Design a protein around this ligand. Sequence first.
Ligand SMILES: COCC1CCN(Cc2nc(C(c3ccccc3)c3ccccc3)no2)CC1
Length: 137
Amino acid sequence: VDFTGYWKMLVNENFEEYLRALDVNVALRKIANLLKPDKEIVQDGDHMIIRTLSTFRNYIMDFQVGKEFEEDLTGIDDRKCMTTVSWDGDKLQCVQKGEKEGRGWTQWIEGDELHLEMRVEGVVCKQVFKKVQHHHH
Ligand SMILES: COCC1CCN(Cc2nc(C(c3ccccc3)c3ccccc3)no2)CC1
């Protein structure tokens, strides 16, 4: 599997409850739920860069698959986690060890769709991105 490309959000399902479960305050939940970030991904051997890009902010994950790293979620839910991203067959599985139980995500591809399930405390948010070709800085 190769996740490299540029991807545009098509749906974002149950995002509000996900953020509610991270204890994000009601006003930021409103701001956050309006954002439709693109995903720019470069898979370079086991080195993955995943840029979640929006006007409100860019969130950059830059990691080595299988190697735990310290993830600074300040500005999201104001936490830090020790995160590990691992291959689970054709799926990318992330566990974010920290204050919240069961926090992570799973990413996979179906045709020209990038699929992203985000999880915390038994709450699930599902996003789907379509692969696009128009790139502007
Ligand atoms: C492979 O992608 C992994 C994903 C898993 C989820 N995190 C955290 C997350 N931030 C957000 C949004 C967000 C949530 C809360 C506060 C501010 C922003 C967001 C939107 C646009 C750019 C950056 C962030 N929504 O979710 C981002 C990377």
